[PDB]
Symmetry: C3
Subunit: 74 residues, 3 copies
Amino acid sequence: GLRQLANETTQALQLFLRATTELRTFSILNRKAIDFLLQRWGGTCHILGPDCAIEPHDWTKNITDKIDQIIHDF
Amino acid sequence: GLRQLANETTQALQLFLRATTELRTFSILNRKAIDFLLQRWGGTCHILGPDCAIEPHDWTKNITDKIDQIIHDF
Amino acid sequence: GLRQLANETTQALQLFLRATTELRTFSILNRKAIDFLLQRWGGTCHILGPDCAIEPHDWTKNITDKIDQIIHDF
Ligand SMILES: [Cl-]
């Protein structure tokens, strides 16, 4: 029951979205610093392999869409 | 009178809190290591600048309180 | 009154699982690069101390199990 629980539940999800967005921004800056460092060691791909291409996708729009849906279907 | 969708949602949110707090602590340890490495290069902030002071906030209290609130609706 | 929401909640959680799974992988790769760079300076543990022995755990199974339980505790 309690379909007004939705705002609370989605506020929790919105807080997680803020947290993961910050984690993403920060971890990418760490890679930026690492890339600089490995430039004279052969470059990041030389050290990590094709794994150097892995980047965290920004799921923000899909998450906000699902949050909106919960509110909409309460 | 069986609303427990929130019960399990709450538990799922708690697992995610544990997982994200771990990512934050680990990513920050990575920056610490990076700061050491960039010392003789002028420091991290002279390589990242308009981004270097960025650190993930700890949203634990905010998330925990929101979860306690949801739990508090029954 | 409506379990489209129980499906939507599970769906937002799955989005967050993919998002955090990507962050964990990327972050661990950043540490891999950092471990390589710190090798000549005594090793990561020499620089970070016992904190060097921590890694984010993979909560995939734990989270997927909770997500399923939600669909079943429908
Ligand atoms: Cl990182």
